[PDB]
From a paper:
[name] is a cysteine protease that mediates the cleavage of viral polyproteins during viral replication and is a high-profile antiviral drug target. The [name]-[name]-2 [name] ([name]) is the drug target of Pfizer’s oral drug nirmatrelvir. The emergence of [name]-[name]-2 variants with mutations in [name] raised the alarm of potential drug resistance. The X-ray crystal structures of the representative [name] mutants S144A, S144L, [name], E166Q, H172Y, and Q192T with and/or without GC-376/nirmatrelvir provide a structural explanation for the drug resistance.
M165 is located at the S2 pocket and forms a hydrophobic interaction with the P2 dimethylcyclopropylproline. The most frequent mutant, [name], had a significantly reduced enzymatic activity (41.7-fold decrease in kcat/Km), while M165L, M165I, M165V, M165T, M165A, and M165C had similar enzymatic activity as the WT. S144L, [name], H172Y, and Q192T represented some of the biggest changes in both the residue size and the enzyme activity, with a decrease of ∼127×, 39×, 13×, and 10×, respectively, in kcat values. Those mutations resulted in notable changes in ligand interactions in the structures. Similarly, the [name] mutation also seemed to lead to diminished interactions between the oxyanion hole and the ligand, indicated by the lengthened HB between the imine nitrogen and G143 amide NH (from 3.0 Å in the WT to 3.6 Å in the [name] mutant). These distortions are likely caused by the bulky Y165 residue through a series of ripple effects relayed by both the protein and inhibitor in a tightly packed active site. In addition to these effects on the reaction center, the [name] and Q192T mutations also directly impacted ligand interactions in the S4 site. The [name] mutation pushes the terminal trifluoromethyl group of nirmatrelvir out of its original position in the WT complex, disrupting its interaction with L167 and the T190 backbone oxygen.
Author numbering:
A (entry chain B), B (entry chain A): 1 to 305
Write the structure that this text describes.
């Protein structure tokens, strides 16, 4: 029993983390094979960041300007290129701790573990969701950029996120490992708006299923509803519309618990319309949308790596 | 910015995790130097667990009965002893990934990272608090026993917890690494009561400090109060009394924010007496007591390892 916000083991990823210094600026890099990936804004001074010309800034840099450190050991940079908002620094050494990995672009509503790092050293691990507006609600300070988000499939690390930017609202934006931002964001120190955010409806239902599994069943009603009837209510309370693809994804949880997806939608309707009456669900006084169906199955049946 | 439930990096600990099988029963062991630590109830069949005589059960066991596996590799057990509720299995090999470590007995209210494992393989990481009643609110299934809780100080792992037991209420109990339970618990399959739990008052204040740092300040009043005046209210709402040792521990957070500890106590009094009125603090609709002062400083100023 129990249900927590649980990150992947970070070991495989801790071994890829390096420090990248250019002039005065230091942040984190990801060392895979003979290549180090970091945010391109490492080349900036503080004045450049207000409106940088990254091409012109990079032109004024050679390989010896890039100090890459892995623990106490320096790596010799033998090449450099800019791919979108990331820098690829070729080094003379393949990382001997390179795990099996891939680069993926994650869809909104999916989750990942963040290994938050400073000076190329790991500080902490937590789980995030990519929000419908392509922000994340992270925990990041000066020096955190280059920190990555990832998923693990048995022994294969899917890197999906690298950290670049904190919005005025204190939420976060970054890129995939090819340097393409998630959302409308750019790497310049200026106030930038995120969308109106929505609630990830499929995740909420997954978490209701996690609650039932763990015995919290007070919210289960006898009533039912349609897909259409539910979505009309969902629109009202700023929830993602529920698709059939979503219903089918919730199938494992439906199957395990013996509560149809549409009956669970019935429960959520009542919850939205009546509130919680000061009661809790899995220790939460509000409705959590940062667990995928797979996160719930993984945790409530104990998938390992 | 941002503030999340953040565990230590788990790499150092992932390297110490092994699988221990006795007869039919399999759980996790902790492999440090030439010694493997696991819960003693690995020697039990399902019938024994209702009321085990651990001494008599262990007597009928020799070294070859203990299958210890580290990945695909078997370790030859050359000795065995029972220390309280843990089994120490001497093996022929020192773990080459043994980190600097210590064993500590943690105080109620303190936090730690759990690396939840099955079949000696890591599944995930989360943070827990030791509750005043010596239970933890974990996420644990069949096979999770042997999973450990730990803290990290630069490069030194303090192991403080090993998992044994889930109460009827779905919370959890276990031992230190010398096999002494936290709380009144025993390793037998019988319903066991935990204390009335209390709220860890020092942690709540630490988390209010985390909120202010992050810009949640709506709950700040310009009142202050005495220590005694606060404690009177605290007793009422089932909060731990606040001591001067507690005030002194909050000194760094007081210092960082420039809000006196007793002015913050003023805010918490009003919060307890009025409730939150549907408002949130760091995304939470209730008051969180599972962050220590050190956890807040670690996160809101970026301590690494
Ligand atoms: C990477 N090390 C940081 C991550 C930041 C630091 C504070 N918390 C974080 O998550 N990246 C940056 O500092 C980037 C960097 C210049 C400005 N920047 C920002 O994140 C800034 N944001 C904005 O300008 C704002 F608020 F308007 F959106 C900052 C004020 C420093 C938080 C560049 C090149 C974009
Ligand atoms: C270790 N592998 C498990 C951890 C459990 C399994 C489900 N969730 C957990 O955290 N340990 C056990 O199964 C221990 C073990 C026998 C029984 N036991 C229990 O935790 C049981 N609890 C009780 O008897 C209860 F609820 F009354 F307190 C169980 C019902 C299986 C959850 C021994 C030797 C104590």
């Amino acid at each position: 029993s129990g249900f927590r916000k649980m990150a992947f083991p970070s070991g495989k990823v801790e071994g890829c983390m390096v420090q990248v210094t250019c002039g005065t600026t230091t942040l984190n890099g990801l060392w895979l094979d003979d290549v180090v990936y970091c945010p391109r804004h490492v080349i900036c001074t503080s004045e450049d960041m207000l409106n940088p010309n990254y091409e012109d800034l990079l032109i004024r840099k050679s390989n010896h300007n890039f100090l890459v450190q892995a623990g106490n050991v320096q790596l010799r940079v033998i090449g450099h290129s800019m791919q979108n908002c990331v820098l690829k620094l070729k080094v003379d050494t393949a990382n001997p701790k390179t795990p099996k990995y891939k680069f993926v672009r994650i869809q909104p509503g999916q989750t990942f573990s963040v290994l938050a790092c400073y000076n190329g050293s790991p500080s902490g691990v937590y789980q995030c969701a990519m929000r419908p507006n392509f922000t994340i609600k992270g925990s990041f300070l000066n020096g955190s950029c280059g920190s990555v988000g990832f998923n693990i499939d048995y022994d294969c690390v899917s890197f999906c996120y690298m950290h670049h930017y904190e919005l005025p609202t204190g939420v976060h934006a970054g890129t995939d490992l090819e340097g393409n931002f998630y959302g409308p964001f750019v790497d310049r120190q200026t106030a930038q708006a995120a969308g109106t955010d929505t609630t990830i409806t499929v995740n909420v239902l997954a978490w209701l299923y996690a609650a039932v599994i763990n015995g919290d069943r007070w919210f289960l009603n006898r009533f039912t509803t349609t897909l259409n009837d539910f979505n009309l209510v969902a629109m009202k309370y700023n929830y993602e519309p529920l698709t059939q693809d979503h219903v089918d994804i919730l199938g494992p949880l439906s199957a395990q618990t013996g509560i149809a997806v549409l009956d669970m939608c019935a429960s959520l309707k009542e919850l939205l319309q009546n509130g919680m009456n000061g009661r809790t669900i899995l220790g939460s006084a509000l409705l959590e949308d940062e667990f995928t169906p797979f996160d719930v199955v993984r945790q409530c049946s104990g998938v390992t790596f």
